[PDB]
Design a binder for these strands. Structure first.
Length: 181
RNA sequence: CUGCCGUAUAGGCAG
């Protein structure tokens, strides 16, 4: 399994939820800049039982990809509000799990607008057809339109072996799993 | 939130 290195970043007091969002956004910028699909995240102090991500962000990658990511100054500026481990090989063996963005059909009105574009119906028709998530999340800003949105994250069932797939520019699964420990 | 894929009131996705 090739994404066998990691770095833990822990939040330092100041508020925690807001700080994690800034950190996660900075990571996104860095991933977009690098353009790859082989850097993953997990939240090892997760409390799914309270929809809390916890205060530890773990970054997962090959040795070379982690080194390249960390070489960029994407953290300087936040550095004083973070505490760092050392980039390291993961323990082994460990289970693996998938850390995924989850989306839902949470707004029927938006569905109706699309359905109207796709079937030339009217709102009353659409409203008849399409009548009126409990996960941790980060709140991000849509850099193109300045709209804030919640990105909900699921840590899936543990399993014994890994996967071949990659990751998005938020570090979330596009098929890939990360070691869980 | 806004949009994309899909006949979908199927299942996904983008920022």
């Amino acid at each position: 399994f090739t994404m066998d290195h990691y770095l833990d970043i822990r939040l330092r007091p100041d508020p925690p939820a807001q700080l994690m969002c800034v950190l996660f956004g900075k990571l996104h910028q860095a991933l977009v800049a690098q353009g790859g699909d082989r850097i993953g995240v997990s939240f090892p102090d997760l409390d799914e039982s309270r929809s809390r991500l916890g205060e530890r962000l773990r970054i997962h990658a090959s040795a070379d990809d982690l080194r390249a990511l960390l070489a960029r100054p994407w953290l300087e500026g936040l550095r004083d509000h973070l505490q760092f481990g050392e980039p390291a090989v993961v323990p082994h063996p460990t289970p693996y799990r998938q850390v995924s963005r989850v989306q839902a059909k949470s707004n029927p009105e938006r569905l109706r607008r699309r359905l109207m574009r796709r079937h030339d119906l009217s709102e009353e028709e659409a409203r008849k057809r399409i009548p009126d998530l409990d996960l941790p999340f980060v709140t991000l800003r849509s850099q193109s339109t300045g709209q804030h949105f919640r990105l909900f994250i699921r840590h899936g069932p543990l399993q014994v072996t890994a996967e071949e797939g990659g990751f998005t520019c938020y570090g979330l699964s596009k098929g890939g799993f990360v070691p869980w420990f």
